[PDB]
Amino acid sequence: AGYVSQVIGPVVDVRFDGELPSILSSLEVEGHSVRLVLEVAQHMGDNTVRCIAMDSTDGLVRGQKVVDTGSPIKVPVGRGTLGRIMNVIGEPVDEQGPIDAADIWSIHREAPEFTEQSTEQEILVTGIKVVDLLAPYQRGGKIGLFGGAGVGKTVLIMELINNVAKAHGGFSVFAGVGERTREGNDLYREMIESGVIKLGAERGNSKCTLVYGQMNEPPGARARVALTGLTVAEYFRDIEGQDVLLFVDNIFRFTQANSEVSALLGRIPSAVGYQPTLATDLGGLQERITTTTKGSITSVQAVYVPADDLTDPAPATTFAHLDATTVLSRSIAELGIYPAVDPLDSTSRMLNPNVIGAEHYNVARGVQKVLQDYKNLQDIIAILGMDELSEEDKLTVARARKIQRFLSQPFQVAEVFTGTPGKYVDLADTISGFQGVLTGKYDDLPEMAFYMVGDIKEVKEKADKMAKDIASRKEADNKKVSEELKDIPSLDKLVSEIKEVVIEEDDGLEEDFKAEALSSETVVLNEEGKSVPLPKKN
Amino acid sequence: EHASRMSAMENSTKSAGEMLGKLTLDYNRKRQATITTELIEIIAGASALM
Amino acid sequence: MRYTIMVSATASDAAPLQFLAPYSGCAMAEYFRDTGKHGLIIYDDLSKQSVAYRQMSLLLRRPPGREAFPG
Amino acid sequence: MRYTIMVSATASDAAPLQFLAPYSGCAMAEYFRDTGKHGLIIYDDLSKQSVAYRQMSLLLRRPPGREAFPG
């Protein structure tokens, strides 16, 4: 009912002789290589709408028919999306059939209004000790994850998915906003490997819906894929009544994508370079993540800080919405502590005694003060000597050295390659455990007693095994037989056991090759449209 | 003397870290203002043609 | 809340509503100023009303000044 | 050169050719990717391809963003 009038990059003008589609409505370009969905951005006047494409616009002709769907982009939602991968417009890209839709929901939505909000401000127990104690998660809050590579971020993602599905019975959505396809495939196969995504007939027992808008997609597709993950999460909140987890992977890439679609629609950029609507384009996403009266959505958003500058407007606008940070550190991970949460740079708004109580608040502030007190004398130990200062200073060294161990915890999705069984730790057990180490009831137990264990009745069994291990050492000796002729042969024997592989100097490359003949003449279309040589006169 | 110098260059790195942090914050302000002012120049140049 | 009016244009709301909400609350508190009573008004994050007004101005294509603000 | 293709859009070439040289070289190397073999593509000075694309887009009067670049 409408036809393409302008194609300028990813930005398509469509003309409607009848009535116009609404802003944010979805339009299908009828007749194309792939499914080309446009989203109406503005009404330009003269019966033209201005749209932003969700796929490539190369191959688009002015006058191509465009069908208005009468609604915004509509995605399949429900339990049938679990363990599937969707793109922004709802198509399955995991190549495992269609998506069993419970409903087909519009991705564009107003935030849950004032009467629906929760005034309670309670804590989301996650089963991770360092996360539950020092930087708790608000049920319905937004949590910034300052991880990276090699700090065990993906294991923490899959464990929040696992522990929230195990404890509270809620499902998870992962919105891969603008992620590389190698990283997205790595996370997919690592979720299949860890059992939070199951393929085939066991597909219903998956805990996670992946919504992937990749980095090679146009800016309109990366700018809207977080809303698709939000819609999948809002179905579980509003219909299933669950405590959902949403993972917006790199909220900065959401910001950068919306900045690109604001630049492409010809809007004047605001401060440093961002979209003029940066606070509202971010708040439109973040205000739909809340606690309703039905359930909640808790959002764990990875935050990239642009030039290591926290006063840049994209992290300064994001940090207004965040309720907790969990900074994952490389220096924590190079002490073998997993999860690699920095126990001192992670913050939470939920850490005050009016929401968690004075018991939990004072235990957390004591633990944080003890680790801080150890932290600002390590330039006094390494300079002047280990046993140089007082015994009370070395008492805080030993207590913080064993609390710094005690924050580590074995993870249930990590047991398929580490062997050590993962241990969910409850909140009251975490409080009662760290209070005991803080007063000094465990000053006699070793420092390796507090390592990769669930709660306080496991550090005792760890030390019990370590002191049964004293009596298991006199069972044998240590020796290495046959100093020069156990299995170490002559080097000619070692080169005469390696097998020669086949190398050929015909490299081939003509295996299933067409070998068309390319014309050197330039071939154009005449006015009838047939392939004709160039008319040889200017 | 050596221990007094060890305590004197302890405060010097403290001072050269707090001065560095102030200077890094002010550099971040100048970086943001540079990008904004060059962008406003480019937009004003383009809008005077279209 | 027996004595408080609570005007809210939250982060999801349109930037015209966030630009206008301190003026709405000021008109509501000027009722108490104008009839002899005393009012207290708290504009929480007037730095966000300025950002909403900057959004409105750059979407109206008004020339940005310092930091991008309309002047 | 028994294994190397060279795709060379030099400085005297037009800006659309410098824009399209990495895409054309990637299309030549995707032959080896797609038919089982292994490729190594080297886009030397993707900075200059970026400058060429900025040239074409400012001359097509697309709206400029940061430093002059398109969206």
Q: Which H/E stretch holds residue A486?
A: none
- Does residue A292 lie in a domain region? yes
A34 assigned to some structural domain: yes
Q: Are residues A272 and A394 both part of a single domain?
A: no
For residues A223 and A282, give the distance between their C-alpha atoms in angstroms, rounded to a whole number.
11
Nearest CA in chain A to B10: A379
Q: If 0-12 CB within 10 Å is exposed, 13-18 middle and 19+ buried, where does residue A192 land?
A: middle
User: CATH number of the domain that B25 lies in?
Assistant: 1.10.287.80
Of A49, A72, A95, which residue is a domain's last? A72
Q: Tell me whether residue B1 is in a domain.
A: no
Whether B48 maps to a domain, the answer reads yes
Q: Which chain B residues touch A315 with a CB distance below 8 Å?
A: none
Question: C52 — contact with chain A (CB < 8 Å)?
Answer: yes
> How far, in Å, CA of A160 to CA of A142, rounded?
14
Kindly determine whether residue C54 and residue A270, on different chains, have CB atoms separated by under 8 Å.
yes
Neighbours of C41 (CB within 10 A): 14
Q: By the 8 A CB rule, do C12 and A283 touch?
A: yes
Evaluate whether residue B3 is within a structural domain: no
Q: Give the distance from residue B28's alpha carbon to the nearest chain D alpha carbon, in angstroms.
A: 17
Q: Is D62 on the interface with A (CB under 8 A)?
A: yes
CB D22 within 8 A of CB D6: no
Question: How far is the C-alpha of D18 from the C-alpha of C58, rounded, in Å?
Answer: 34
Number of Cβ within 10 Å of residue A262's Cβ equals 28
Which residues, at least 6 apart from A276, have a Cβ–Cβ distance to it below 8 Å? Answer: A262, A267, A268, A269, A270, C54, C55, C58, C59, C68
Residue D6: which residues within 8 A CB-CB, separation 6 or more? none
The binding site of A for Mg(2+) comprises 154, 179-180, 183, 249
Q: Do chains D and A touch (3 or more CB pairs under 8 A)?
A: yes
Rounded distance between C-alpha atoms, residue A109 and residue A238, angstroms: 13
A402 touches A450 (CB < 8 A): yes
**Cβ–Cβ under 8 Å, residues A342 and A152:** no
**Beta carbons of D66 and A264 less than 8 Å apart:** no
Per the CB < 8 A criterion, the answer to whether A129 and A427 are in contact is no
DSSP 8-state secondary structure symbol assigned to residue A79: G
Rounded to whole angstroms, how far apart are CA atoms A391 and A102?
65
The number of distinct structural domains making up chain B is 1
The CATH number of the domain holding residue A22 is 2.40.10.170
Instruction: Output the CA–CA distances (angstroms, integers) from residue A423 to A159, A264, A433, in the order listed.
Output: 11, 49, 14
Instruction: Tell which residue, A535, A481, A398, A422, has the closest CA to residue A158.
Output: A422
For residues A155 and A409, give the distance between their C-alpha atoms in angstroms, rounded to a whole number.
Answer: 12
CB burial class (10 A; 0-12, 13-18, 19+) of residue A104? middle
Distance CA A203, CA A205 (A): 5
Residue B23 forms part of a structural domain: yes
C-alpha A31/C-alpha A52 separation (Å) is 18
Whether A298 and A259 share a structural domain: yes
A395 Cα distance to chain centroid: 39
Task: Enumerate residues 6+ apart whose C-beta is below 8 A from A278.
Answer: A255, A258, A259, A270, A313, A314, A317
C-alpha A255/C-alpha A274 separation (Å) is: 8
CB A134 within 8 A of CB A364: yes
Which residue is listed with tokens 């191959």?
Answer: A59
Q: Do A202 and A286 share a structural domain?
A: yes
Paired strand residues for C59:
none
Establish whether D34 is an annotated binding residue: no
Contact in structure between A75 and A107 (CB atoms under 8 Å): yes
Phi, psi of A255 (to 5 degrees): -60, -45
CA distance C61 to chain A (A): 7
Phi then psi dihedrals of residue D45, to 5 deg = 60, 75
Question: Which residues in D have their CB inside 8 Å of a CB on B?
Answer: 61, 63-68
Q: What domain range includes position A433?
A: 351-479
Distance CA A379, CA A387 (A): 13
**Which DSSP symbol is given to A200?**
G
Q: How far apart are the C-alpha atoms of A75 and A229, rounded to whole Å?
A: 9
Does A33 share its domain with A6? Answer: yes
> How many angstroms separate the CA atoms of A412 and A402, rounded?
23
Write D12-15 long-range contacts (CB < 8 A, 24+). D15/D52, D15/D53, D15/D55, D15/D56
Dihedral angle over CA of A478, A483, A486, A490, nearest 10: 150
- Residue A184 near residue A214, CB atoms below 8 Å: yes
- Asked whether residue B19 is domain-assigned, the answer is yes
Token readout for A168 is 């509270």
- On whether residue B13 sits in a domain, the answer given is yes
Residue type, A156: L
Assess whether A193 and A230 both reside in one domain. yes
Distances (CA, A) of B44 to A270, A378, B31: 13, 54, 20
A476 and B CB contact within 8 Å: no
Is residue B2 one of the residues assigned to a domain? no
Distance from CA of A379 to the nearest CA of B (A): 10
SS3 sequence, A260-276?
A: HHHHHCCCCCCCCCCCC
**What angle do helix axes A391-406 and A427-439 make, rounded to 10 degrees?**
160
CB of C64 within 8 Å of a chain A CB? The answer is yes
d(CA A374, CA A371): 5
A366 lies in the same domain as A425: yes
Which residues of chain A lie closer than 8 angstroms to B25, CB-CB?
311
Tokens of A374: 């150890």
Kindly state whether residues A356 and A337 are assigned to the same domain.
no
Are A469 and A345 members of one domain? no
Q: Count Cβ neighbours within 10 Å for each residue of A448-467 and write b for 16 or more, e otherwise.
A: ebbbbbbbbebbeebbeeee
Domain containing B48 equals 9-50
Can you tell me the distance from the alpha carbon of A427 to that of A357, in angstroms, rounded to the nearest whole number? 12
Establish if C9 touches chain A: CB-CB under 8 angstroms. no
Cα B46 → chain centroid: 30
Query: Can you give the resolution of this entry in Å?
Result: 3.2
The burial class, CB within 10 Å (0-12 / 13-18 / 19+), for A109 is: middle
In sequence order, what E strands does A46-130 have? 48-53, 65-68, 74-77, 85-86, 103-106, 123-124
Which amino acid belongs to residue A111?
A
* Pairwise CB contact (< 8 Å): B42 & D64: yes
Is A38 part of any domain?
Answer: yes
Instruction: Give the domain CATH number at A251.
Output: 3.40.50.300
The number of distinct structural domains making up chain A is 3
- In a mutational test of the C interface, the residue from B28, B34, B38, B40 whose CB has the highest number of chain C CBs within 10 Å is B40
Chains in touch with C (3+ beta-carbon pairs under 8 Å) read A, B
Q: At what angle do helices A219-238 and A251-264 cross, to 10 degrees?
A: 130
Answer whether the bond into residue A343 is a cis peptide, omega within 30°.
no
Q: Are residues A363 and A445 in the same domain?
A: yes
Taking the CB of residue C2, how many other CB atoms lie within 10 A of it?
A: 3
CA quadruple D19, D23, D25, D26: dihedral sign: positive
Nearest CA in chain A to B25: A309
Nearest CA of chain D to the CA of A251: how many Å? Answer: 18
Q: Which amino acid is at B33?
A: A
| Residue D68, min C-alpha distance to chain A (Å) | 11
| Residue in A268, A272, A383 nearest the CB of B32 | A272
Neighbors of chain A by Cβ distance (3+ pairs < 8 Å) = B, C, D
Helices in chain B by DSSP H: which ranges?
A: 2-47
Is the Cβ–Cβ distance between A90 and A73 less than 8 Å? yes
Q: Domain holding A472: CATH number?
A: 1.10.1140.10
Q: C-alpha angle A138/A282/A233, rounded to 5°?
A: 55
Radius of gyration of chain B (CA): 21
Nearest by CB to residue A286, choosing from C8, C11, C55, is C11
Tell me if residue B19 falls in helix, strand or coil: helix
What values do phi and psi take at A141, rounded to 5?
-100, 175
Method in brief: cryo-EM
Q: Which of A330, A349, A368 is the last residue of a domain?
A: A349
Among candidate residues A410, A421, A413, A430, the one with its CA nearest the CA of residue A338: A410
Calculate ∠ Cα A526-A529-A532, nearest 5°: 45
Contacts of C65 in chain B (CB under 8 A): 40
A349: left (phi over 0), alpha (psi -120 to 50) or beta: alpha
Q: Is residue A486 part of a domain?
A: no
In a domain, A268, yes or no: yes
Token pair listed for A27: 């339009």
Q: Do A453 and A443 share a domain, yes or no?
A: yes
Q: Which amino acid is at A381?
A: I
Q: Are A2 and A66 in contact (CB under 8 A)?
A: yes
Kindly report the number of other CB atoms within 10 A of residue A394's CB atom: 16
Domain match, A297 and A157 both? yes
Residue B50 lies in a domain: yes
* Binary contact (A279, C59; C-beta < 8 A): no
Q: Are residues A327 and A252 in the same domain?
A: yes
Domain end marker among A461, A479, A497:
A479
Distance between CA A490 and CA B26 in Å, rounded? 67
